[PDB]
TrEMBL record, chains A, D, F:
Family of this protein: Belongs to the arenaviridae GPC protein family.
Residues with attached carbohydrate: 13, 23, 33, 43, 53, 91, 116
Entry protein name: Pre-glycoprotein polyprotein GP complex
Parent-record interval covered: 66 to 244 of 490
Cystine connections: 20-123, 52-79
Organism per entry: Mammarenavirus lassaense
Source organism, top-level taxon: Viruses
Swiss-Prot/TrEMBL site (Binding to the host receptor LAMP1) positions: 26-27, 122
From TrEMBL, chains B, C, E:
Source species, domain of life: Viruses
Notes on the domains: Contains 1 fusion peptide at the N-terminus, 2 heptad repeats domains HR1 and HR2 and, at the C-terminus, a cytoplasmic domain that plays a role in ER location. Also contains a zinc-binding domain that allows SSP retention in the GPC complex by accepting a cysteine from SSP as the fourth ligand.
Residues of the full protein shown: 276 to 414 of 490
Name assigned to this protein: Glycoprotein G2
Locations listed in the record: Virion membrane; Host endoplasmic reticulum membrane; Host Golgi apparatus membrane; Host cell membrane
Length: 137, 139, 139, 137, 139, 137
């Protein structure tokens, strides 16, 4: 007889990042039970200066390495870090950033924003899974 | 016989397989399921043998990825997705159980296409072939 | 049974094999021929589904290379060539057909050395070994 | 009984590049049925200035991505693009360029030239095959 | 049958196996020993054919690494070492000889942990499983 | 019955580098039968200037490629080259260099030095093996 089974990935909440999608313009990636990054499609600019300091960010040594390792590997495959916060935006190059964003999830939008947030029970229908980050790694 | 708990299944409590079926996870490298077993085992070892993590370990998982999982199969599934063919989502798996006896089969993952899980009618050939495989395995 | 047409063969029209023979292309990863089958299938799928290409799809092939072909075998053949040993050219393939019955074998690519397709005697022993395989396949 | 079969790679004319050799000093790579690159060993200089601009070429947006992706991946593993044409030269570093050229084909020469040409039935004996590009890629 | 000389063994002079046992080094890719055989073969071919090495050939080995060895297994062993599990050092191997007849088995490497070679008591399960494997192979 | 065997890697003295350790603060990598590099831990600085030249070293052409190819690979995964000698200093970034050094061998120290030396029967208990360089490569 045929039988089916579904896997719950929230037992990998440590030692592996998890990610799930909520709306066609929002994505969420989680590290631990307290911190995550928001991947948001918007028509509103958050920063104006065209300078993205990243070496000074790691040289600051007042940050969380796990939080921005994901954004570093996203960059490999402008910014504003004043005060210790995390805020990255990509404006529309567009093909690559949208392809990476779709690689997470497995138009006429102006900005894609990566920002720090606290964990909430965000994603509605898609259960969390670590496959996207394994693929983009 | 490797066994799965209620914390790593949805709607199920205890569901597990013979060790002889799990033995195929180090011989054939075209199976979508054994990667999840490797991830689960690595997670258990990491949470047991390493205590009080300093806010998550990123390099350790970064390097276990190169040593545990199959990157080619992941790229194959991605290419299928971007090209409108049924692919695998790494979240749903089907198998055969043979309820009269108990001998089971290694799960093959469900095929997802167009955001809908295609039913047993559109891949019944795989079911028949695997049933024939267990029929041969009966001898 | 996978079959080869007259547009992908030179001097031949319809020369094709049984499915049970092609079944070895997803179990053993030392065969030089299955890469060509994978490339042909990818080409057929690409020209069929993705319609009206805009001056070639360089990224599609760039990403399918990582998913379909064996880069280690290509590098092995290249290293063998630069070090002056009979290697493979990816253009000539020999096999057995057993004309009395029809059952055939998966081709192994020809051995090229010094810009000359070395003759059947120089590797005849291999032939015999494969014959023994069909002997083991006689039962 | 033993039989031999040979494969015609021109069925991969689209969706895969093809390459074949004509003489020891000439090589051809072909994309589609109208465009290709000539790889020529020569002792004649075509351009003088010692500056190769490649970022400006992609920023021009009046080009063909398929043509120069191959030369990009060749560079990874001086130039003159004025008017939209493609012309790259390597003057004689020698070991690497000759090794790459021999890798495609699978001294007393001063230059190797990469240039744009229209398809012709060039290569005499060597049938086209995509293994060279799969190796370089 | 591949035979090991006295220059590549310590405390031994001639110790070698049937070719049928060595036949598993191109089928199963979970073996820790066959990489050493491939390195020995590459070394013999390099010192035989290529003559008068001018201060070593660094690129030749840099490109033979990508074609001959299994980087995933090396990284697996390194992860085990940095995660405090018995691992392999690529220097000690244990096999069975069956001294009554002479038929042997492909060596599996020793398990090194905490700078000490754990004795036969701590991995006797593998010994029993392999003995059962030869028992099945008797038929 | 059960029998064990040990492999002598010194048959690979040519065509493959061999590495074997002597003390916790010393490592030795060997090319050929005459030349090798010392990887040493010390509390004494040997150079003062904070400028490491590597492109000039390869452009010098009066050097040995095999010796500094290994150090190039080590760099990828200050300096002082005057006179043709080899001397690389890493002062204590620490996590990466110690991890690479431990990878070869398979605290409260100040500097790690890579230097040229002549072959001697250095390593006391650890027999030579090429697995370290295969890992670093
Ligand atoms: C999907 O859900 C998101 C989140 O609710 C919507 O994005 C906006 O979210 C903010 C709260 O952070 C609300 O105040 C807005 O009303 C939401 N909408 C807009 C247009 O800003 C989003 O609209 C939803 N739908 C889509 C298609 O993304
Ligand atoms: C974000 O701004 C863009 C502006 O570029 C909006 O895109 C426009 O959408 C309308 C109707 O959907 C079209 O008539 C315009 O031609 C579009 N402008 C383009 C393509 O440049 C987009 O709808 C905005 N998104 C939201 C959620 O308001
Ligand atoms: C994301 O991380 C940054 C960096 O810590 C947070 O920014 C500061 O967080 C501390 C800790 O709560 C606050 O005391 C500061 O007031 C924050 N800075 C500012 C300018 O508000 C940021 O709050 C985090 N994101 C969220 C949603 O909490
Ligand atoms: C290989 O073929 C090319 C193409 O014909 C030869 O190149 C020609 O060389 C002569 C000089 O001997 C020129 O006059 C022609 O114009 C060249 N043809 C071109 C540029 O299309 C080449 O000589 C042949 N042999 C070798 C060894 O390359
Ligand atoms: C391009 O330059 C090379 C030299 O780098 C020429 O090769 C020389 O040709 C002359 C002909 O008289 C020989 O005497 C030399 O022995 C060759 N080698 C060297 C190193 O000089 C080559 O011929 C030149 N190209 C052409 C078309 O003449
Ligand atoms: C290779 O491509 C370049 C870029 O288009 C061609 O250069 C121009 O091509 C157009 C189209 O035929 C001509 O109208 C121009 O006159 C060309 N430029 C110059 C300076 O002549 C180039 O012709 C192509 N190569 C070949 C052999 O056709
Ligand atoms: C390991 O062996 C080395 C090599 O003998 C020792 O290094 C010596 O250290 C003493 C004390 O500083 C020096 O006087 C010697 O000159 C050093 N030897 C050489 C060859 O330079 C080292 O002390 C030993 N122990 C450790 C823990 O490294
Ligand atoms: C490591 O290599 C360098 C570069 O050749 C050596 O430095 C010179 O070696 C020659 C050969 O004996 C000597 O004649 C020079 O006097 C050396 N230069 C200096 C500044 O001393 C270096 O000696 C080599 N290392 C060892 C231990 O011999
Ligand atoms: C990004 O968006 C547009 C370019 O498309 C531009 O107006 C805006 O200033 C840019 N901002 C940054 C920070 O690059
Ligand atoms: C970094 O921040 C400084 C301070 O405003 C600014 O002058 C510089 O342009 C920034 N650079 C980058 C790359 O963000
Ligand atoms: C197969 O059916 C038996 C019936 O009792 C059940 O106990 C077992 O869990 C089933 N197999 C799986 C893998 O769930
Ligand atoms: C084997 O021989 C038969 C005889 O008719 C022929 O039809 C068949 O095509 C041959 N096989 C191949 C692979 O050519
Ligand atoms: C290339 O060739 C030689 C260098 O060996 C030199 O004479 C010539 O000017 C160089 N030209 C360019 C454009 O680099
Ligand atoms: C393009 O190359 C020319 C060569 O003469 C050079 O003068 C010019 O500065 C270059 N443009 C760039 C690098 O943007
Ligand atoms: C097994 O024992 C026999 C007894 O003579 C010996 O010849 C043979 O070498 C042994 N096998 C190995 C692998 O050493
Ligand atoms: C190379 O050495 C010179 C001589 O002091 C120095 O000026 C220069 O900065 C050095 N270059 C590097 C890259 O260290
Ligand atoms: C290296 O060590 C320290 C930096 O931690 C510093 O005192 C010393 O001058 C440095 N020297 C060089 C050459 O970088
Ligand atoms: C080197 O200096 C450090 C100072 O932090 C000291 O702890 C260490 O013991 C010194 N090394 C030796 C060999 O004395």
């Amino acid at each position: 007889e045929l039988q089916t089974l579904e896997l719950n990935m929230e037992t990998l909440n440590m030692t592996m990042p998890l990610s799930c999608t909520k709306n066609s313009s929002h994505h969420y990636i989680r590290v631990g039970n307290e911190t995550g990054l928001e991947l948001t499609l918007t028509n509103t600019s958050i920063i104006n200066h065209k300078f993205c300091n990243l070496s000074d960010a790691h040289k600051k040594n007042l940050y969380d390495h796990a939080l921005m390792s994901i954004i570093s590997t996203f960059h490999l495959s402008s910014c504003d870090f004043n005060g210790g916060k995390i805020s990255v935006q990509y404006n529309l190059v567009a093909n690559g950033v949208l392809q990476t964003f779709m690689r997470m999830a497995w138009t006429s939008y102006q900005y894609l924003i990566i920002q720090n947030t606290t964990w909430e029970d965000h994603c509605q229908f898609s259960r969390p899974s670590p496959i996207g980050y394994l693929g983009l790694l | 016989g490797y066994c799965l708990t209620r914390w790593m299944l949805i709607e199920a409590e205890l569901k597990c397989f013979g060790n002889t079926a799990v033995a195929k996870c180090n011989e054939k490298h075209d199976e979508e399921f054994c990667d999840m077993l490797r991830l689960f085992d690595f997670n258990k070892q990491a949470i047991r043998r390493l205590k009080a993590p300093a806010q998550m370990s990123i390099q350790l998982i970064n390097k276990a990825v190169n040593a545990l999982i199959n990157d080619q199969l992941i790229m194959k599934n991605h290419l299928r997705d971007i090209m409108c063919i049924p692919y695998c989502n790494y979240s749903k798996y089907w198998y055969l159980n043979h309820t009269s006896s108990g001998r089971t089969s290694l799960p093959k993952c469900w095929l997802i296409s167009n955001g809908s899980y295609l039913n047993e009618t559109q891949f019944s050939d795989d079911i028949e072939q695997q049933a024939d495989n267990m029929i041969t395995e009966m001898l």
